Amino acid sequence: PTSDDIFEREYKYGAHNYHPLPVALERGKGIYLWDVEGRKYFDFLSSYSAVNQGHCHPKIVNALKSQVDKLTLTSRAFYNNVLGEYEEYITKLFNYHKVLPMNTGVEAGETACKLARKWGYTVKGIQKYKAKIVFAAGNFWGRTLSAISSSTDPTSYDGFGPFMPGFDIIPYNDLPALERALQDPNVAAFMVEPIQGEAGVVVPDPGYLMGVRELCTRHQVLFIADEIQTGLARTGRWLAVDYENVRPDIVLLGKALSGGLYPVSAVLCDDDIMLTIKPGEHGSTYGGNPLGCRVAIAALEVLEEENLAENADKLGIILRNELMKLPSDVVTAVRGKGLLNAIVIKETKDWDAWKVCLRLRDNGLLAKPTHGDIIRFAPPLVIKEDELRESIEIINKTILSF
Amino acid sequence: PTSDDIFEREYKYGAHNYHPLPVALERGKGIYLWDVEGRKYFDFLSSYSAVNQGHCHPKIVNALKSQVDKLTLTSRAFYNNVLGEYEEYITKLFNYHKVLPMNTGVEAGETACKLARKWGYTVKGIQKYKAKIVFAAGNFWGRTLSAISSSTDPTSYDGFGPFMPGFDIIPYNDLPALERALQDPNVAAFMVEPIQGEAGVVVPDPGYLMGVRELCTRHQVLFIADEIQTGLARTGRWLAVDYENVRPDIVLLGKALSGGLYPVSAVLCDDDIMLTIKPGEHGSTYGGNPLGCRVAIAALEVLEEENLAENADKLGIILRNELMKLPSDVVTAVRGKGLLNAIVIKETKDWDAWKVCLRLRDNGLLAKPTHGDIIRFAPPLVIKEDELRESIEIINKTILSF
Ligand SMILES: Cc1ncc(COP(=O)(O)O)c(CNOCC[C@H](N)C(=O)O)c1O
Ligand SMILES: Cc1ncc(COP(=O)(O)O)c(CNOCC[C@H](N)C(=O)O)c1O
Numbered sequence: 001p002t003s004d005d006i007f008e009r010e011y012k013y014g015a016h017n018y019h020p021l022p023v024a025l026e027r028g029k030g031i032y033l034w035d036v037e038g039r040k041y042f043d044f045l046s047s048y049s050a051v052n053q054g055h056c057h058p059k060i061v062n063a064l065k066s067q068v069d070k071l072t073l074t075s076r077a078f079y080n081n082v083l084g085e086y087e088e089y090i091t092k093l094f095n096y097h098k099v100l101p102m103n104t105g106v107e108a109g110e111t112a113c114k115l116a117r118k119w120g121y122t123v124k125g126i127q128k129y130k131a132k133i134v135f136a137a138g139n140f141w142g143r144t145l146s147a148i149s150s151s152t153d154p155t156s157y158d159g160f161g162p163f164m165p166g167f168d169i170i171p172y173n174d175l176p177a178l179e180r181a182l183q184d185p186n187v188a189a190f191m192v193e194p195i196q197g198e199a200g201v202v203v204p205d206p207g208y209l210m211g212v213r214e215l216c217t218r219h220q221v222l223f224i225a226d227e228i229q230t231g232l233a234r235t236g237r238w239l240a241v242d243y244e245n246v247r248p249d250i251v252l253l254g255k256a257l258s259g260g261l262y263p264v265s266a267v268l269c270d271d272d273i274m275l276t277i278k279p280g281e282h283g284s285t286y287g288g289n290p291l292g293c294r295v296a297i298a299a300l301e302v303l304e305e306e307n308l309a310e311n312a313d314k315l316g317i318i319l320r321n322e323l324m325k326l327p328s329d330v331v332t333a334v335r336g337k338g339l340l341n342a343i344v345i346k347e348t349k350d351w352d353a354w355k356v357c358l359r360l361r362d363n364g365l366l367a368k369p370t371h372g373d374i375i376r377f378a379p380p381l382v383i384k385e386d387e388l389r390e391s392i393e394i395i396n397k398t399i400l401s402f
Numbered sequence: 403p404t405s406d407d408i409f410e411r412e413y414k415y416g417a418h419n420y421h422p423l424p425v426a427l428e429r430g431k432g433i434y435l436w437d438v439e440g441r442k443y444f445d446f447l448s449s450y451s452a453v454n455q456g457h458c459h460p461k462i463v464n465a466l467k468s469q470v471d472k473l474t475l476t477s478r479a480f481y482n483n484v485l486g487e488y489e490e491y492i493t494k495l496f497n498y499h500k501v502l503p504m505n506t507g508v509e510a511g512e513t514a515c516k517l518a519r520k521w522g523y524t525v526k527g528i529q530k531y532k533a534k535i536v537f538a539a540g541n542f543w544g545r546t547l548s549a550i551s552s553s554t555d556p557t558s559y560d561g562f563g564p565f566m567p568g569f570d571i572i573p574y575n576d577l578p579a580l581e582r583a584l585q586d587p588n589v590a591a592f593m594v595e596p597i598q599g600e601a602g603v604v605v606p607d608p609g610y611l612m613g614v615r616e617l618c619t620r621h622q623v624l625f626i627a628d629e630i631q632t633g634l635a636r637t638g639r640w641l642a643v644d645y646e647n648v649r650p651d652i653v654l655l656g657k658a659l660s661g662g663l664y665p666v667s668a669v670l671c672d673d674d675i676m677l678t679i680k681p682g683e684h685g686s687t688y689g690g691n692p693l694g695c696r697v698a699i700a701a702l703e704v705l706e707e708e709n710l711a712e713n714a715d716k717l718g719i720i721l722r723n724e725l726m727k728l729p730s731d732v733v734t735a736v737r738g739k740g741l742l743n744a745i746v747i748k749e750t751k752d753w754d755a756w757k758v759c760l761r762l763r764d765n766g767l768l769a770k771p772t773h774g775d776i777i778r779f780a781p782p783l784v785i786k787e788d789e790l791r792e793s794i795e796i797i798n799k800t801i802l803s804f
Contacts, residue, residue: 001483009486013493014690015502018478019681026483028473036483047477048687061470068463071430073662075449076420077770081428081438084408087415100417103665104505105687110546117563129564143684144512145566146547155682161519162531164547165564188563255687260475263505263665263688279421280557282545285450285507285657286665288416368479 003036021357021368028055031380031387033366042391044367044379049197049229049340051260053302054380060259063298064291072291076283086293093300094238094251096268100277101288105228105254106142108265111282112191112224112250113146115269117166118276120188124220129166131188134181136172140198141191141226141252150191172196173204175211182219189222189249194240197229200374201342203335209244216249222273228254228265229340233303233381236313236338243337249273259299264292308381312338315388319377322392326399340378347373351402359401365394405438423759423770430457433782433789435768444793446769446781451599451631451742453662455704456782462661465700466693474693478685488695495702496640496653498670502679503690507630507656508544510667513684514593514626514652515548517671519568520678522590526622531568533590536583538574540601543593543628543654552593574598575606577613584621591624591651596642599631602776603744605737611646618651624675630656630667631742635705635783638715638740645739651675661701666694710783714740717790721779724794728801742780749775753804761803767796 001009003024023041027034031054033041046052053060067082074080083101091099100115102108113133120131135150142148148157149164157163168187170177178190194209196202216223225248230240232253237243239251250273254265263286286292303309316338323334323343333344345353353369360367369375379391403411405426425443429436433456435443448454455462469484476482485503493501502517504510515535522533537552544550550559551566559565570589572579580592596611598604618625627650632642634655639645641653652675656667665688688694705711718740725736725745735746747755755771762769771777781793 003481006481006483006486009490010481013486013489013500015500015676015679015684016681017502017679017684020479020481022481024481024483025476026473028476033476033480045477045479047475048479050475050477050687056471056474064470065467068466068663069458071428072458073449073452074427074430074435075447075452077422077447077450078435078768079405079408079412079422079424079426081403081408081426084411084415088411091415098415098417100419104509107506107508107546113547114545114562118561120563121561128561131563133563143686144509144546144548145515156684158683159520159523159530160516161522161533161535162567164566260691261470261693274417277417277419279418281560282417282419282558284545285452289662291663366480 001036006036021361021366023361023366030054031383040364042365042379042394044365044377044391046378046380047260048255049234049378050255052232052234052256052308052381053259053299054382055260057259057302059302060261060295060298063294064261067291067294073286073289075285076288080290082290082293083288086297089297090266090300091268094268096251097270098268098274100267100274102265102267102284103263103286105265106144106147107284108228108252108254108267109141109147109226110144111267112252114282115250115267115273115276116189116222116224119222119273122276123272124188126186126188130186132166132168132184132186134168134170134187134190136192137169138172138196138199138202139193172202173208175208175215178212178215182215182221187221189224190216191224191226193226193230195230195235195337195340197340198370200370201336201340201376203337209241209246213246222249224248224250224252226252228252232256233309233312234338234340236316237309240337257299258292258295259302262292262295264296306382312381315339315383315385316341318385319388319392323395326396330399339381342370342374342376345373345375356398360394360398363394363398365391403438408438423763423768425763425768432456433785442766444767444781444796446767446779446793448780448782449662450657451636451780452657454634454636454658454710454783455661455701456784457662459661459704461704462663462697462700465696466663469693469696475688475691477687478690482692484692484695485690488699491699492668492702493670496670498653499672500676502669502676504667504669504686505665505688507667508546508549509686510630510654510656510669511543511549511628512546513669514654516684517652517669517675517678518591518624518626521624521675524678525674526590528588528590532588534568534570534586534588536570536572536589536592538594539571540574540598540604541595542600574604575610577610577617580614580617584617584623589621589623591626592618593626593628595628596632597637597739597742599742600772602772603738603742603778605739611643611648615648624651626650626652626654628654630654634658635711635714636740636742638718639711642739659701660694660697661704664694664697666698708784714783717741717785717787718743720787721790721794728798732801741783744772744776744778747775747777758800762796762800765796765800767793
């Protein structure tokens with residue numbers, strides 16, 4: 001089937017909840033993706049930061065192939081031999097007492113909201129169902145009825161029935177607004193992204209995370225750091241939060257936790273918070289299955305062994321310096337950390353972010369516009385300087401061809 | 403590590419949201435599971451109906467091993483070659499216009515709630531945020547803040563902050579209550595399980611589903627059938643709903659959709675409902691990835707080719723007839739359809755469902771008590787009559803040994 005047959009078939013048998021860049025991939029390895037016509041491409045999206053270790057990384061693939069012959073799912077009704085191994089590894093790696101395994105990113109978020117609320121009632125002493133959770137405008141943590149309830153983006157909540165009560169929204173990168181919001185003794189937690197990904201890679205001012213930690217601690221409020229897209233070497237550290245050396249009360253992980261081979265997410269925190277949930281009070285069918293645990297352990301090792309954090313840090317700096325050379329009347333802004341970057345295209349009476357991506361595609365590079373005029377540049381953390389240089393050249397020639 | 407080391411390790415590094423039957427499995431094939439001491443067991447839980455095709459079914463395993471070398475995740479920002487193939491297959495198999503791919507079961511539910519609400523406003527004409535969705539008491543469709551909001555089980559909602567508005571709860575297996583509830587013109591849908599699984603396999607009276615369909619159609623309300631645990635041959639048909647020949651407006655699938663090798667769920671419905679959601683109004687990172695689609699196609703073929711529906715129907719009848727021979731002062735009730743059955747143990751001043759399961763385990767069979775005194779008996783649909791007979795004998799000797 002041609003790319004056109006592929007596009008047409010999905011349009012007929014699948015929901016129209018997406019409008020993808022017209023490219024039909026069928027194979028991918030490392031930083032490259034090949035479509036059905038054999039055309040090769042640089043991947044500058046990494047599946048929203050899920051394939052940080054590059055597509056089909058051999059070590060993770062081996063772990064999957066190995067475990068599938070033994071066991072894949074027993075459910076948590078019975079114990080399996082792998083889960084506890086994974087748990088000990090990840091908790092010690094991130095330095096938290098326990099981990100609660102889930103599958104998708106939203107589930108990690110929902111679980112965090114449930115931990116905060118339960119903790120608020122059983123430990124903080126908030127009266128039943130009066131607990132609040134504060135969010136920062138621009139946030140994105142999923143597509144569930146609750147996740148869209150804290151959203152400020154009309155496209156995610158508009159027309160989606162009544163919303164979840166108890167969610168307060170304050171401006172992002174604003175300590176005064178946080179302190180003001182934390183005056184209410186019924187607030188159990190504050191959930192924030194160290195860098196807002198889907199918003200368009202909006203980076204907060206230095207000192208912000210440190211202030212959030214201080215403010216939360218001062219008001220006996222839980223600091224929930226959503227590291228589902230910024231964590232795992234993407235920004236240049238194990239956790240974006242590490243840049244300010246802060247320790248959140250709850251950390252959320254997902255996406256790259258499996259290298260893109262299996263839906264695996266996790267929420268980490270100490271006993272005083274984790275143990276508020278008793279047996280039978282929360283779960284998931286596939287959450288914590290043997291197969292997902294093997295790929296997770298493998299995916300974490302790849303990040304550590306191949307020192308992808310420092311590679312991400314160095315190259316990100318090169319990438320940004322090069323992007324900043326583009327003409328201001330084209331690229332109005334360049335921002336990011338590590339390999340999580342974005343540029344703001346000055347949308348005009350001619351071009352826009354979509355068109356740049358269409359031509360970028362035509363020149364061998366894949367990317368996607370976040371909010372109409374923003375273009376994210378996030379290649380797998382296994383990319384090499386020379387390869388980065390070649391792609392930078394593709395970005396330059398495309399940008400300067402309009 | 404011994405089973406005891408395994409138990410101990412999880413207790414230290416993992417959340418205590420579960421209290422599993424003390425058994426540490428490490429390998430499973432077909433209807434069997436082997437623990438770390440080499441002890442063999444009959445699996446009568448099937449991971450909550452996720453491994454209907456038996457553990458590590460060769461055909462599904464092959465599909466996974468094959469696709470992993472090619473592509474695993476591109477995100478829906480770009481097209482991949484597999485998704486459309488899966489979509490055409492599943493939509494035609496179940497006879498619906500389109501399918502919206504998700505990962506976990508709760509996600510399928512959340513997506514269904516969003517479809518109903520969006521349809522209610524944009525098509526039915528309900529005023530913004532006045533749309534309601536009716537649920538039946540005893541229902542279970544997940545662990546998200548919204549899923550627990552429609553729950554009547556204290557263990558899932560107690561202490562979990564304020565709840566989602568717009569959810570009405572009526573008694574299960576009650577047509578008069580449904581009609582009464584559907585008098586409110588703001589009701590967009592009714593979500594029901596053809597047989598309530600986690601409740602304890604509670605089967606509604608014959609004619610119920612037919613009445614639900616008639617009532618919903620009469621009030622221009624969407625009939626959402628949650629077939630995440632009852633569907634895919636488990637009850638003796640492709641869908642439990644098939645027993646009354648009814649066609650729901652939206653069908654939810656999950657668990658066995660992948661044979662236990664990958665988290666894959668789906669929601670099926672016609673264009674008039676599906677197309678209410680526009681591009682960018684709903685999504686998921688891993689939802690619809692190439693890898694999950696390959697295992698799904700394979701998992702569906704196994705069910706069809708090996709005629710697991712009829713096998714489930716025949717053997718279920720044998721299983722129930724045999725269970726009904728047990729003494730009334732021990733087993734107060736036996737119920738189910740196909741291989742989705744349960745017995746009610748008369749809890750006394752001596753024994754309870756947990757103890758029966760402990761001894762059942764000691765005799766070579768694994769099962770789990772749903773609500774303190776109910777024991778579910780759900781073995782993989784690949785089980786053979788002789789094997790079923792051997793397990794029935796284990797059930798008898800254990801039951802009659804108290
Ligand atoms: C009928 C039904 N619908 C939806 C779901 C939710 O599926 P998940 O994949 O778990 O999101 C289920 C739930 N099956 O319950 C098993 C219990 C689970 N381990 C729990 O603890 O959450 C069902 O049955
Ligand atoms: C920061 C962050 N937190 C949570 C999640 C949600 O993860 P899911 O695995 O998607 O459940 C994300 C993900 N947002 O990117 C996914 C976009 C997707 N196309 C959508 O429509 O849901 C992030 O970034």
